[PDB]
Write a protein that binds this ligand. Structure first.
Ligand SMILES: NC(=O)c1ccc[n+]([C@@H]2O[C@H](COP(=O)([O-])OP(=O)(O)OC[C@H]3O[C@@H](n4cnc5c(N)ncnc54)[C@H](OP(=O)(O)O)[C@@H]3O)[C@@H](O)[C@H]2O)c1
Ligand SMILES: NC(=O)c1ccc[n+]([C@@H]2O[C@H](COP(=O)([O-])OP(=O)(O)OC[C@H]3O[C@@H](n4cnc5c(N)ncnc54)[C@H](OP(=O)(O)O)[C@@H]3O)[C@@H](O)[C@H]2O)c1
Ligand SMILES: [Mg+2]
Ligand SMILES: [Mg+2]
Lengths: 439, 439
């Protein structure tokens, strides 16, 4: 801990303070160059945007600018630490946005703790940005804030901690259902924990075909049943079950095909997994420590499919899998929203990439490929270079079909060539070398 | 126009859209590199800032980050064009901030037209930035907005269109009084126009020693006198004079030592210059076309000292002379404000650089130096490389003495050497070559 802490503190304070810098995209050394980057020259772009608001994507950086906005109320796993203390996290997220999709990011830390005040603050910034990524806002205010901002603004508003993990988890459940040969309309699902990542996953899975009468939820109190507390929260009363004497996790797990966990460590035990239905699908996403260790489940039930959020186990749910590429697809077509069809276009592409993989140009002997679709490889690996070329055109085409695109793509072959060109300029070959050298 | 228009539109539409890009400052290609910039690594800086908010300058880019914020209500000379149409101007101002002082800038365009709502939007963004530059906001809302933000926020708030021109124009008058040998407390000033740049100039000049009873202001209606309109706006009533019959500019120009002009073209005539006192000091800053052409003034009064806002004449009052360097000085010492003592320190440094000049290392014959103090050289030239080495330490020292500095500078020789190092690594040698080539 101390070594990791010291290496992180020095990781960037010493060369210059902090990551991120703003750089001009032009050489500038003369007059007549400053006379049209400013001065009477800069009045020509302004008078064009005034006549046509759609011309702002030609003359400014708006078509490539995303805001990462937070108020510091749920920062990683630290909790409520304040907007100022969460600045490094937002800078890091902007770094990830740039590294894997080439998207410029402004990270904004708002001091408002009141939801309506926060909404008023964010809705006023629309002319600056081409899209908004809400990050690290505690539940249940996140649902209300995102819903209000989405119905108030004419640029995409995407809360990543809700919807990115939902997209990845839905892609994993569809692929796992193929392995175990079940149907989405018959499966019994048990959800542990209600919160930012859980409500959104249930919503997406219902949108793809899961029956709401096949879902039971449990939180820190136990089973969410109807009339348990006098005033149950919204989004918690939409999944409450009729009272039947069931109050703990052990009552509802018998016969469950799917376990979805986003709540605490050591929640699911070996006996409960034993009582589960044949070929169980288990998603233990609790971050410091999963609800069950994958070795402890594969022993009692070796036919189980397990999917955690850690890097030392297969099938890792890492949010870097979708957000840069969905935002790239939305930005490149001038979409005014990221709707459900665009969101479902991302689920299908991610699942397809893992069960229709066509490798090519492996990392020599330097690594470990085993990209065979099955219980151990159900979703793509977090830094797979083909994720930009699969997701972004699918999201762009979905945007063009739901009528939310303002700058439609004429030829998708040219677009795919450009994206492949971008991805060739970025390879991470030291990662396979380090991984192989670990053994 | 059409040639200039087409060249300016193409200036940045074609390589990529718009100026500005966001770049990481640390190399990112491996794991353990995207595990300190994010992942469990990024939690260590966050817990440091939670304990001590001052550590946000060590682990984060806040100590070098400035916001240029506008609502597009007074954009250059175009007027009320909207926040979105003014985005190129803000990007250009950020580029100038980066070129001459090495300061990262986020340009923010806010759609709010209501002053109190605008204030609520801006004050909430304080954790993001180390300082605020207000830009292109029409009067009289600008005074109210700036006063409220300054009393509300704990980082420097600085409206450039008021205070930068006030500082530069006060430096010119201070030097011109040296040339013409007059005392600040005994001169009569006539101000043509009352607005963002005029009220601020008068306030600063009065702060330096001008008697308020030696000032007469004259807006588009003529002389501003007591009881002229039923509800005379504030900032226009503190400079109203008693009613004496004086209504036009012709009745107040006789015997005036200083004429300050920030209102329209062809306001001052030759016969009105003929009536001024000995050695008239004239500042005609109306940007499209000045109040009087300097040749027309010099024809009748060869001893007159004329300043303009146009570069084709000597003594050009250009805002690039002030804002980057005062912001650099305030940022380097952790100033929580830019008060009056810091504003006047910048006035003296600018005046000293021109009346106590020691040239050295001219651009050989490639240029036109003639940097001798006198009527034709009263303030430094717009891109003089010694401006940051003179202004930033003066402002930092003033912040240290007025008590608003949170990170005092221990050694000023080290600071000056660092600023000199920055100056060396950015030289504009093509400008004097082109200027001499034109002659
Ligand atoms: N892709 C990923 O790896 C990924 C993505 C998102 C989240 N996660 C992880 O998932 C966890 C929760 O994230 P979140 O956004 O959902 O935050 P959250 O809603 O604030 O926390 C989970 C919620 O579930 C309930 N809960 C907590 N402990 C529980 C327990 N032992 N048994 C049952 N319910 C419990 C609590 O709700 P009540 O207090 O109302 O009962 C709690 O607020 C964290 O560990 C997070 O890191 C992982
Ligand atoms: N460093 C520089 O070169 C520099 C810096 C700042 C400004 N400027 C220039 O100065 C001018 C004014 O700037 P500002 O910010 O003060 O704008 P402003 O506040 O919008 O306009 C100046 C005010 O002067 C009055 N006025 C207008 N025409 C007049 C006339 N013909 N005779 C007398 N008064 C008149 C009007 O006040 P009423 O409507 O209340 O009568 C007007 O609102 C512009 O040309 C601007 O570009 C130059
Ligand atoms: Mg997050
Ligand atoms: Mg301006």
């Amino acid at each position: 801990d101390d070594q990791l802490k010291q290496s992180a503190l020095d990781f960037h304070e010493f060369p210059v303070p902090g990551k991120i810098q703003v750089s001009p995209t032009k050489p500038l050394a003369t007059q007549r160059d400053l006379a049209l980057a400013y001065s009477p020259g800069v009045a020509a772009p302004c008078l064009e945007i005034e006549k046509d608001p759609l011309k702002a994507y030609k003359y400014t950086a708006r078509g490539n600018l995303v805001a990462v906005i937070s108020n510091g109320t749920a920062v990683l796993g630290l909790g409520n630490i304040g907007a100022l203390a969460g600045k490094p996290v937002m800078e890091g997220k902007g770094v990830l946005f740039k590294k894997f999709a080439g998207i410029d990011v402004f990270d904004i830390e708002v001091d408002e703790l009141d939801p309506d005040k926060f909404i008023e603050v964010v809705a006023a910034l629309e002319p600056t940005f081409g899209g908004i990524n809400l990050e690290d806002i505690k539940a249940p205010e996140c649902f209300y804030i995102e819903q209000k901002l989405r119905e108030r603004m004419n640029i995409p508003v995407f809360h990543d901690d809700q919807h990115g993990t939902a997209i990845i988890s839905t892609a994993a459940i569809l692929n796992g259902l193929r392995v175990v040969e079940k149907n989405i309309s018959d499966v019994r699902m048990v959800v542990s924990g209600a919160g930012a990542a859980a409500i959104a996953c249930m919503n997406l899975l219902v949108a793809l075909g899961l029956q709401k009468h096949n879902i039971v939820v449990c939180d820190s109190k136990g089973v969410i049943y109807q009339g348990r507390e006098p005033n149950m929260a919204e989004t918690k009363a939409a999944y409450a079950v009729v009272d039947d004497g069931k109050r703990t996790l052990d009552d509802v797990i018998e016969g469950a095909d799917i376990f979805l966990g986003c709540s605490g460590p050591k929640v699911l035990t070996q006996e409960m997994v034993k009582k589960m239905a044949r070929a169980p699908m288990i998603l233990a996403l609790a971050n410091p420590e999963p609800e069950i260790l994958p070795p402890l489940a594969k022993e009692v039930r070796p036919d189980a499919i397990i999917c955690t959020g850690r890097s030392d186990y297969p099938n890792q749910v890492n949010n870097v899998l979708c957000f840069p590429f969905i935002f790239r697809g939305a930005l490149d077509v001038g979409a005014t929203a990221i709707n459900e069809e665009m969101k479902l276009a991302a689920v299908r592409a991610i699942a397809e990439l893992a069960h229709a993989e066509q490798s090519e140009v492996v990392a020599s002997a330097y690594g470990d490929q085993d990209l065979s679709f099955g219980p151990e490889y159900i979703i793509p690996k977090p830094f797979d270079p083909r994720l930009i070329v699969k997701i972004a055109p699918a999201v762009a085409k979905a945007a063009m079909e739901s009528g939310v695109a303002t700058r439609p793509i004429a030829d998708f072959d040219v677009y795919i060539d450009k994206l492949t060109e971008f991805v060739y300029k970025t390879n991470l070959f030291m990662k396979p070398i380090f991984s192989q050298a670990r053994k």
